[PDB]
């Protein structure tokens, strides 16, 4: 099989600037007909892949001419000039010369923007949930940048570990921020035994770690 | 315009056969093109599985050994993926395509011995005049669920998070919306949850 390699898992770019995404093949993708069979795709969050470039340099439909493909043989570049916030997503190369068709591992385009502190909200367990013997406490960190954010759960000032999970949205195509949700899961018995529930957030945009809390 | 749509089971047991259908509209599958199946694993790696051509000829990825067939029914403008002897390694989002240009929306297939289970839906109640509220969609299997707010009338400020797989092997997902404190007295907020695998629909009103 032809192996496709994209060296960078991600690349940061300031809007208005240009970026190059690299792809390498294990064999030349030039066909005897004179075309080079390297395609590029973009996948936006929660969407199907979209064709950007076919046959190395031909612009597919519905793509601004800000996007261009170049290269030769085994080395290829997708260049995006005048990057916009909406360009965020994962860019994949694919060789189309021989079967099986094979993909590069993808390069995520990350848009650089001003630091934004998360807005933080904490939610106690609902009475509805408490009835079943389990309690989930939720902490929301909304619209922050950069990605790096630390959540620490405390119950009556005791640091929690091993009993929470978090997920994060992909970079927003419009405002270039992230959001994060963290859930602390305890038995109802354990929940009713303690008073103070606190989510402590550490992030570059904060003057000092911020705590949101409630009393049960 | 040409469109493609995947359909089929979202949960398959290990060692059994996976079958999916692609229904093509506004184009005859015998008229031209290659008709592909491509899958995307958790972690987001893409794999080309194979195609069927306008003459019904095939080409498949050797990675699938002899487990794959792609067949068609021209009378219905449908083509089909069959994958035998599946394992958890075959858990992926499956896309049908016409060449490289036209893609279906994709369909998730999870390979697991576990049973389908519908979600419980719990309110995340609202407490600078800034508020937030939401719904916790807990203990369902398999993925996906969909969440809307006020039947799609409310989209501004909505964040629906990727589900997390709990240690129990069931998923949990949150959906939140940032709202003005000034709206809490008079605006109704309803999260609309649909878990198609279990045929569960839940509307939950979220109140202060």
């Amino acid at each position: 099989d032809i192996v496709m390699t994209q060296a960078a898992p991600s690349v940061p770019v300031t809007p208005g600037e240009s970026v190059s995404i690299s792809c390498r093949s294990s064999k030349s993708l030039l066909h005897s007909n004179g075309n080079t069979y390297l395609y590029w795709f973009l996948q936006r969050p929660g969407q199907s892949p979209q064709l950007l470039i076919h046959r190395m340099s031909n612009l597919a439909s519905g793509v601004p001419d800000r996007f261009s493909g170049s290269g030769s043989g085994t080395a290829f570049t997708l260049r995006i000039s005048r990057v916009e916030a909406e360009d965020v997503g994962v860019y994949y190369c694919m060789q189309h010369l021989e079967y099986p068709y094979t993909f590069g591992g993808g390069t995520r385009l990350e848009v650089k923007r001003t630091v934004a502190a998360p807005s933080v909200f904490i939610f106690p367990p609902s009475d509805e949930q408490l009835k079943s013997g389990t309690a989930s406490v939720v902490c929301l960190l909304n619209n922050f940048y950069p990605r790096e954010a630390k959540v620490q759960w405390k119950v009556d000032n005791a640091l929690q570990s091993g009993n929470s999970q978090e997920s994060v949205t992909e970079q927003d195509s419009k405002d270039s921020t992230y959001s994060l949700s963290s859930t602390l899961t305890l038995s109802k018995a354990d929940y009713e035994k303690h008073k103070v529930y606190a989510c402590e957030v550490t992030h570059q945009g904060l003057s000092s770690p911020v705590t949101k809390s409630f009393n049960r | 315009d040409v469109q493609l749509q995947e359909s089929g089971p979202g949960l398959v047991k290990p060692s059994q056969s996976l079958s999916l259908t692609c229904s093509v509209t506004d184009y005859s599958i015998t008229s031209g093109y290659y008709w592909n199946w491509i899958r995307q694993f958790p972690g987001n790696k893409l794999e080309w599985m194979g195609y069927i051509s306008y003459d019904g000829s095939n080409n498949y990825n050797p990675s699938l050994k002899n487990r794959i067939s792609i067949t068609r029914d021209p009378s219905k403008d449908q083509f089909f993926l069959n994958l035998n002897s599946v394992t958890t390694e075959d858990t992926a989002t499956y896309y049908c395509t016409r060449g490289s240009l036209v893609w279906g929306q994709g369909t998730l297939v999870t390979v697991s011995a576990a049973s389908t289970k519908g979600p419980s839906v719990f309110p995340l109640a609202p407490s600078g005049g800034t508020a937030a509220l939401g719904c916790l969609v807990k203990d369902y299997f398999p993925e996906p669920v969909t969440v809307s707010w006020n039947s799609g009338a409310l989209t501004s400020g909505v964040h629906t998070f990727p589900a997390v797989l709990q240690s129990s092997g069931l998923y949990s997902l949150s959906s939140v919306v940032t709202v003005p404190s000034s709206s809490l007295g008079t605006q109704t907020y309803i999260c609309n949850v649909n878990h198609k695998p279990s045929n569960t629909k839940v509307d939950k009103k979220v109140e202060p």
Binding site: H31, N33, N35, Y37, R55, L97 | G32, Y33, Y34, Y54
Partner: peptide, 9 residues
Amino acid sequence: GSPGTPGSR
């Protein structure tokens, strides 16, 4: 011949 996707015949 061509490794590209064939169009309408």
